[PDB]
């Protein structure tokens, strides 16, 4: 359990390691992107309209990084509990187990 645990919690880091590296990322695109859009005389709702499209693609990416930490929780609850005669209807969780 040790060993494993160990490892899991390693995996489940390089996840958010990658969340966190990535949602950065994307934010910065916004900044130099919103730069350009007052560099060039714009529109106020065209400035706004960029920043709701570029809103809602981070939490695409924040979503996207949510649902493998879940998935990833589940796989070592699942296993650490386990015990038999219990079910399992997932079929790509238990593959993963």
């Known amino acids: ?10 995996e489940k880091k390089a996840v958010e390691d ?4 990535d949602l950065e990322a ?3 695109k ?19 309209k960029v920043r709701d499209s570029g809103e809602r693609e981070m939490r695409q990416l924040r ?3 949510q649902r ?10 699942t296993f650490t509990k386990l015990a038999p005669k219990q079910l399992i209807v997932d079929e790509v969780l238990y593959r993963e187990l």
């Open 18 to 21: 990658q969340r966190d590296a």
């Open 68 to 77: 493998e930490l879940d998935r990833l929780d589940e796989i070592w609850n």
């Open 30 to 48: 916004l900044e130099a992107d919103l730069a350009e859009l007052e560099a060039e005389g714009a529109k106020s709702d065209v400035r706004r």
């Open 63 to 65: 979503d996207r990084a």
């Open 1 to 10: 359990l040790s060993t494993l645990e160990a490892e899991m919690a390693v």
């Open 26 to 28: 994307r934010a910065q």
